[PDB]
Design a binder for this molecule. Structure first.
Ligand SMILES: Cc1cc2nc3c(=O)[nH]c(=O)nc-3n(C[C@H](O)[C@H](O)[C@H](O)COP(=O)(O)O)c2cc1C
Length: 117
């Protein structure tokens, strides 16, 4: 099955991407070489709701799983709705090791209802 995902290392400065799936690269139109080491906020742009970005920032702080829908942009500037699922990954001793972020492309939640959040 097709899997859009990236893995970040929160033990390195500003939670850089250390792995991006082929499907993620195809969705976003970026090369692997040009996004390794980036914070995944590079997918955001003007239309991205900063209230939703705050919800992600809080979930990362608390190391809790969250799903949000927000506007992201391809390399060529095409807007897409991203239903984004964040999962903390802990080592055998319960210490945070990675985050994995899974992206589903689509306006799953209609914008008019999303706006009631
Ligand atoms: C593993 C992982 C994957 C992420 N994937 C996305 C994404 O696909 N789209 C997006 O807008 N933000 C994504 N983010 C969120 C941003 O990297 C960042 O955490 C968010 O914008 C909140 O922090 P900031 O206020 O410092 O930007 C992801 C974060 C992590 C840790």
């Amino acid at each position: 099955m097709e899997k859009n995902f990236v893995i970040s290392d929160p033990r390195l400065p500003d939670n850089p991407i250390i792995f991006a799936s082929d499907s993620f690269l195809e969705l976003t139109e970026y090369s692997r070489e040009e996004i390794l080491g980036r914070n995944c906020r590079f997918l955001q742009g003007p239309e991205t709701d900063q209230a939703t970005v705050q919800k992600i920032r809080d979930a990362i702080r608390d190391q809790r799983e969250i799903t949000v829908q927000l506007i992201n942009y391809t390399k060529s500037g095409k807007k897409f709705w991203n239903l984004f699922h964040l999962q903390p990954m802990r080592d055998q001793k319960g210490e945070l090791q990675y985050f994995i972020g899974v992206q589903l492309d689509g306006e799953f939640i209609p914008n008019p209802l999303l706006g009631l959040d």
